[PDB]
From a paper:
However, AquaCyp300 elutes in SEC-MALS as a mixture of monomers (60%) and dimers (40%) when injected at a protein concentration of 1 mg/ml. AquaCyp300 is active as a PPIase as well, but it differs significantly from AquaCyp293 and human Cyp18. A moderate PPIase activity was observed only for the Leu-Pro containing peptide, pointing to pronounced substrate specificity for hydrophobic residues preceding proline. In contrast to AquaCyp293, AquaCyp300 differs from hCyp18 and EcCypB at six out of nine active site positions. The residues His54, Gln111, His126, which contribute to the PPIase activity of hCyp18 as well, are substituted by Tyr, Asp, Met, respectively, providing a plausible explanation for the low PPIase activity and high substrate specificity of AquaCyp300. In AquaCyp300, the first eight residues are not resolved in the crystal structure, presumably because they are mobile. In the AquaCyp300 crystal structure the six monomers are indeed arranged into three dimers. 50 residues form the AquaCyp300 dimer with an interface area of 1713.4 Å2 (12.9% of the molecule surface), placing the active sites of AquaCyp300 on opposing faces of the dimer. In particular, an extended hairpin structure enriched in hydrophobic residues (including three phenylalanines Phe258-Phe260) at the C-terminal extension interlocks the two monomers. To our knowledge AquaCyp300 is the first reported dimeric cyclophilin.
Hirschia baltica contains two cytosolic and five periplasmic canonical single-domain PPIases, but also two large, homologous cyclophilins with 293 and 300 residues, which we term AquaCyp293 and AquaCyp300, respectively. Our data reveal a unique two-domain architecture of AquaCyp proteins, in which the catalytically active cyclophilin domain maintains extensive contacts with a composite domain formed by terminal extensions and internal insertion elements. The crystal structures of AquaCyp293 and AquaCyp300 demonstrate that AquaCyps fold into two domains, a classical cyclophilin-type PPIase domain and the NIC domain with a novel mixed alpha-helical/beta-strand structure. Both AquaCyp proteins are stabilized by a conserved inter-domain disulfide bond.
Residue numbers in the entry:
A (entry chain E): 8 to 279
B (entry chain A): 9 to 279
């Protein structure tokens, strides 16, 4: 029995210690992956993939990922990890590769070209593509998505983090999170070889361990890492875009083009 | 200021792989030994002969041995070098671009690019060009020379791109590409971009370049022999079209027939 996708919920816009131009990340949507290198922190996105977020939370709370491995890692591509097995406790999910575009959705359009989509921009701090009917998350670097088999509804336990942009995967995979801290540790993960079992790390060697995985909500509040994200629908966010397009430093005797790759735009995200 | 010399064409000596491949000359292979493993880089005197010669001189003088990747910003660049003033190594004239030659056999990428009107490949390197000039692209895993605001101030300290930094194109001397050990570059100790521009702070130190050598400094049978596919040949198109045309039923939404010039992998093999 494949688990059907539930209805999406827009991300909370609760004001934080910062101005009304920022939103609090809810603690249940913060995942802390502890590796020997340090902690990888991820913001989950139930606005695009509520079914996968719920599943991920369940597995994390159930300690299902503790001691598991990033068993498949290809440099410059993705770092993939999970239970590396089928478990009757965790049946497959319906794919959540895109969502209906809603009238309430406040997308900040990026007013320069993109190679893969006619329209790209930002929605609640996440990079997105959209058309008249649909919206989807972009496979920018540091995005969390669910691995699957050829049939779309086969994902549900094993995930990957993008090491570089993989835009060709857009609208074919369930993206349900983004890295907000510790991306450097993802980059330290033991690599496999793409020409050997598709990057699966081979015996006698094993991928680096997920020593523990928790939700911030599992910690007592006074130990919870408090994160806030700039609201990308505000005028203040444009600077984060115009700083990369308009480069006036005398360093440049050849003025750079007024263009920025949507996946290079950094959304202000701060620990509070 | 050391003036820039005339560019020199890359060797097209055929290898074990055949006439559609070229051997990389050992003098144009740099081996950076880290605690993680070896980073190998192919130098490009076709674009930056002056910087290549300088870099070769410093490597042979063992000037980089025991030095650090002292400035590293995740997703940006890993910068290393002597991190000091040295009278032995005066600044070089910038080599940020070269005249486009009719003899240049550029393989044009026939899809859009965000930063340049024409992009493609020249002797296994990503390039941009117009009517008059050609330049190397700041794709990931490219080696370039750090400098100050004045163009002719580079010459000792270099950086390796961790991700594409195309906005730097035509403003910096790019003079090499990583051909092996990119994963080790990604393991390098990081600094913090909001603290001294990513310079790693005491008591911590950047990871050490334990040794830096040219392959040519080794005896022939210990030299790593690398060959690169000639990008002007028809065989190279697959490396492009494999990523543009994805017909696998895995994709129920067929990807657009487009590839970022910096995502194209030029066949490069150890033999
Ligand atoms: Mg990139």
């Amino acid at each position: 029995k494949i688990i059907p996708k539930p209805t999406p919920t827009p991300l909370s816009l609760e004001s934080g210690m910062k101005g009304e131009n920022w939103r609090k990340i809810e603690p249940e949507n913060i995942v802390v992956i502890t590796t020997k290198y340090g902690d990888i922190l991820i913001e989950l996105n139930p606005e695009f993939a509520p079914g996968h977020v719920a599943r991920f939370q369940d597995m994390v709370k159930a300690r299902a990922y503790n001691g598991k491995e990033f068993y498949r890692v290809i440099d410059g591509f993705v770092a993939q990890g999970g239970i590396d097995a089928e478990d009757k406790k965790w049946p497959p999910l319906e794919i959540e590769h895109e969502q209906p575009l809603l009238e309430a959705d406040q997308i900040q359009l990026l007013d320069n070209d993109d190679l893969f989509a006619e329209k790209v921009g930002f929605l609640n701090g996440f990079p997105v593509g959209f058309d008249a009917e649909k919206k989807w998350l972009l496979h920018c670097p540091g995005m969390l998505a669910m691995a699957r088999d050829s049939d779309p509804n086969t994902g549900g336990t094993d995930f990957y983090i993008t090491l570089d942009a993989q835009r060709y995967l857009d609208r074919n995979m369930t993206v349900f999170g983004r890295v907000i801290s510790g991306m450097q540790y993802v980059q330290k993960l033991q690599r496999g070889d793409k020409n050997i079992e598709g990057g699966v790390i081979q015996s006698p060697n094993k991928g680096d361990e997920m020593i523990s995985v928790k939700l911030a909500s599992e910690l007592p509040e006074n130990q919870q890492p408090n994160y806030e994200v700039m609201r990308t629908e505000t005028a203040g966010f444009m600077n984060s875009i115009n700083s990369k397009r308009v480069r006036s430093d005398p360093f440049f005797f050849n003025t750079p083009p007024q263009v920025v790759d949507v996946c290079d735009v950094e959304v202000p995200t701060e620990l509070v």
